[PDB]
Scaffold this active site. Structure first.
Site, short mmCIF file in Angstrom:
data_model
loop_
_atom_site.label_atom_id
_atom_site.label_comp_id
_atom_site.label_asym_id
_atom_site.label_seq_id
_atom_site.Cartn_x
_atom_site.Cartn_y
_atom_site.Cartn_z
N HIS A 116 -62.97 72.14 43.10
CA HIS A 116 -61.78 72.35 42.19
C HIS A 116 -60.41 72.25 42.87
CE1 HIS A 116 -64.32 73.40 38.71
NE2 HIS A 116 -65.20 73.63 39.64
N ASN B 48 -59.61 68.79 32.89
CA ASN B 48 -60.70 68.00 33.13
C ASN B 48 -60.65 67.57 34.56
OD1 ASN B 48 -58.67 65.88 32.62
ND2 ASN B 48 -60.40 64.52 32.56
#
Length: 196
Positions: free
Chosen positions: A41, A30
């Site tokens: 990311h 998550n």
DNA sequence: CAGCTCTGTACGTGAGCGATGGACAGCT
DNA sequence: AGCTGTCCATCGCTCAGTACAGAGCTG
């Protein structure tokens, strides 16, 4: 975070970076706070992901979080997470949330059908396996799993989380073996394809 | 019993914070 | 010489899943 409150970051989400014809989709747990803050990311300064990517030869240069949107086209790699909600950390998440995410994940994988679904974290594959394959193994291992995503030829591959929280693999160097084997697997699958 | 599952304890590196204080230059 | 401030090197500290024992369960 440069003056932005936790309370604010809790409400943010991190977009998927998915396309057809990928070799690999990296599935995180998550978003943590820094991911939520950046909108990219694996921005954590000590997260191992981008280091391992380079050290393994999955990228031929050292990339960073800001390069994430280039991965599909240039490197055959995309990104999603098992759970969309940002949390201070992975144990803030409930079982129901993980199982919801699992269902959503499998539909995404059924849609985009990468060669390899990479679980960045054993804990999220433990959940996915029980939910999706009905298999809870004594000793789940890292690496290649013996099941395909249902209705697809997509393989499932598990690595220790790139998070530097885990002590059992204290450095990037201690995880890179899995990235190298992931590279090997990709190259084997492309070989098979070339040769049919 | 024996195999589950469920819950809580314990664990190594390295990056980057705020705090601290040493080196140094500008000014008198 | 003496005073004072900035810069920056350095420190201590914090902190970003996994393995496993044991308790609980159930066949």
């Amino acid at each position: 975070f440069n003056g932005v409150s936790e309370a604010e970051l809790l409400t943010k989400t991190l977009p998927d970076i998915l396309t057809f014809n990928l070799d690999i989709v990296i599935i995180g747990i998550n978003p943590g706070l820094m991911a939520a803050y950046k909108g990219h990311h694996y921005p954590g300064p000590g997260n191992h992901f981008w280091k391992c990517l380079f050290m393994s030869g999955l990228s031929e240069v050292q990339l960073n979080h800001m390069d994430d949107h280039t991965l599909p086209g240039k490197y055959g790699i995309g990104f999603t997470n098992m759970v969309e909600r940002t949390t201070p950390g992975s144990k803030d998440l409930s079982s129901k949330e993980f199982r919801e995410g699992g269902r959503i994940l499998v539909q995404k994988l059924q849609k985009y059908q990468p060669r390899i679904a990479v679980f960045n974290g054993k804990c999220i594959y433990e959940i996915f396996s029980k939910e999706v394959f009905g298999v809870k193994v004594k000793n789940l291992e890292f690496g290649l799993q013996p099941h395909k995503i249902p209705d697809t030829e997509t393989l499932c591959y598990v690595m220790p989380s790139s998070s530097a929280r885990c002590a059992q693999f204290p450095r990037a160097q201690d995880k890179v073996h899995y990235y190298i084997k992931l590279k090997d697997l990709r190259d084997q699958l492309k070989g098979i394809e070339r040769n049919m």
